[PDB]
Amino acid sequence: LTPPQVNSILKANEYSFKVPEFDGKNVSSILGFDSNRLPANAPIEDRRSATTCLQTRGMLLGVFDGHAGCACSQAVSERLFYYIAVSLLPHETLLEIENAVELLPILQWHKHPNDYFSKEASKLYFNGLRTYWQELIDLDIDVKEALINAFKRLDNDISLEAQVGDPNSFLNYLVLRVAFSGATACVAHVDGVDLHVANTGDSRAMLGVQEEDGSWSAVTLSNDHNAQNERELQRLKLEHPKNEAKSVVKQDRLLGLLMPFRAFGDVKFKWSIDLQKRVIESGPDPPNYHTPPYLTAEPEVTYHRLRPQDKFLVLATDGLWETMHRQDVVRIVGEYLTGMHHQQQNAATHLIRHAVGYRDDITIIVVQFNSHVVGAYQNQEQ
Numbered sequence: 385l386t387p388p389q390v391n392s393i394l395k396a397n398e399y400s401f402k403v404p405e406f407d408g409k410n411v412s413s414i415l416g417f418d419s420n421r422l423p424a425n426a427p428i429e430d431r432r433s434a435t436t437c438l439q440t441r442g443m444l445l446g447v448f449d450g451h452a453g454c455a456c457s458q459a460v461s462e463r464l465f466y467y468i469a470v471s472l473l474p475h476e477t478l479l480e481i482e483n484a485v486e487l488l489p490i491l492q493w494h495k496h497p498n499d500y501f502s503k504e505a506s507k508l509y510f511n512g513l514r515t516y517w518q519e520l521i522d523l524d525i526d527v528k529e530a531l532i533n534a535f536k537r538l539d540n541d542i543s544l545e546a547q548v549g550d551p552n553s554f555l556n557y558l559v560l561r562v563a564f565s566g567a568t569a570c571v572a573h574v575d576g577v578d579l580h581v582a583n584t585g586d587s588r589a590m591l592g593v594q595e596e597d598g599s600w601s602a603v604t605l606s607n608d609h610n611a612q613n614e615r616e617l618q619r620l621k622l623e624h625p626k627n628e629a630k631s632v633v634k635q636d637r638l639l640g641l642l643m644p645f646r647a648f649g650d651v652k653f654k655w656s657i658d659l660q661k662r663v664i665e666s667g668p669d670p671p672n673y674h675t676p677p678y679l680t681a682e683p684e685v686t687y688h689r690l691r692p693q694d695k696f697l698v699l700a701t702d703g704l705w706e707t708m709h710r711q712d713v714v715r716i717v718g719e720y721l722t723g724m725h726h727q728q729q730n731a732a733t734h735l736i737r738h739a740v741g742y743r744d745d746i747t748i749i750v751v752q753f754n755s756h757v758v759g760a761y762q763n764q765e766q
C-alpha cells in the first residue's frame with residue numbers, strides 16, 4: 385500500500401479499448417474507453433463493466449459501488465446489462481430467442497482479464513432472464529423507460545431468488561449473499577449521438593465539454609442519491625408518514641445507517657421483518673423501521689445528445705469524487721487526452737494517480753467520443 389505497490393496495482397488492473405477504426409464505413413461515436421481500479425477493501429467491493437450491444441447499435445458502460453461485501457456489486461455487474469439489452473429488444477428477436485431455446489449473441493463484453501463472471505449461477509441467472517423476456521413477449525421503444533424497467537426487474541429478481549434459494553447449498557448461499565449485500569449502479573447507454581445515463585446511488589457520471597477557447601467545462605449527468613441531495617431528502621420524507629420525517633434519515637444516513645439512498649441488494653431495508661427473519665433461518669452466515677419499503681434500486685435517467693464539443697465521459701464511484709472537485713477531474717482528463725498535461729499511458733490510470741497522489745475503493749471509466757463522427761451525425765440532422 386506504498387506508492388510502488390499501488391503503482392503495480394494500477395498497471396495490473398489497467399484496461400483500454402479502442403474502437404475498431406475501420407474504414408468499412410463505420411458509425412462509432414465512441415473513440416474508445418479506459419478503465420482502472422484501486423482496492424481499499426479485501427475483495428474490492430467496486431466493479432466495472434463495459435459492453436457493446438450485438439443486437440442493438442448502442443454500448444453499455446457502468447460502474448458499481450458495492451457495500452457489505454462484493455456479492456451484490458459482482459452480480460449486478462454481470463446481470464444488469466443483459467436485462468437492459470433484452471429490454472431494448474423488439475418483439476421478433478425476443479421471439480426467435482425464445483423459440484431458440486426449444487442460442488444467439490446478445491452482448492459482447494470488454495472485460496479486463498482480472499474481472500470475472502459467476503461460476504455456478506450461469507444457469508440460474510439465465511433462467512431468470514428467460515422468464516423476463518417471456519414476460520415481454522407476453523405483451524417503438526423508449527430507452528429511458530427500458531432502463532428503469534431493466535433496473536427494477538433485476539432488483540426484484542434478486543429479492544425473490546433469495547426467497548426460493550436453490551438446493552445446491554452454494555447456490556442458495558450465493559442468492560442470499562447477493563440479496564443481503566448491496567450495490568450502487570451508474571450506467572451509460574450510448575447509441576450514436578444519444579447518451580442515456582441511468583443512476584442508482586452515489587456513484588456519478590460527468591461529461592467533459594471543451595469550450596471554444598480550449599478551457600474545460602464539466603456538466604453533471606447524474607445526481608448523487610445521498611444526504612447532500614435535497615430533492616432526494618424530500619422524496620424520502622414524502623414516501624413515508626409525516627411522523628417519520630424525523631427518522632427516515634437520522635444522521636446523514638438512511639435510517640441512520642446507509643449513505644446511498646438508492647441501491648440494489650440491501651434487502652434489510654426493503655423486506656418486511658417477518659420475511660427477513662424466516663429467510664434467515666437457512667445458511668449460517670434497523671432503527672425506526674415503521675413503513676418497511678425504504679430503499680429502491682430505481683434509477684434516475686437523464687438524456688443527453690452528444691455534440692462536437694463533448695469530448696469524453698467519466699464514470700466513477702465516490703472513491704474518486706471524494707478526493708477531487710468535479711471540474712478538476714474534467715480539467716485533468718481533458719488536458720491528458722488533449723496532450724497538454726505537460727504545459728507551463730491510460731486516461732483512467734492518469735486520473736486515479738491524481739486522486740491518490742486513500743480511504744475507499746476507486747474505479748473509473750473514461751469514455752472518449754469521436755467528435756468527427758458525432759459531428760457527422762449532427763450534419764445529418766441539421
Ligand SMILES: [Mg+2]
Nearest residue numbers: 429449450451
Ligand atoms: Mg463501496
Ligand SMILES: [Mg+2]
Nearest residue numbers: 449702703744
Ligand atoms: Mg465507494
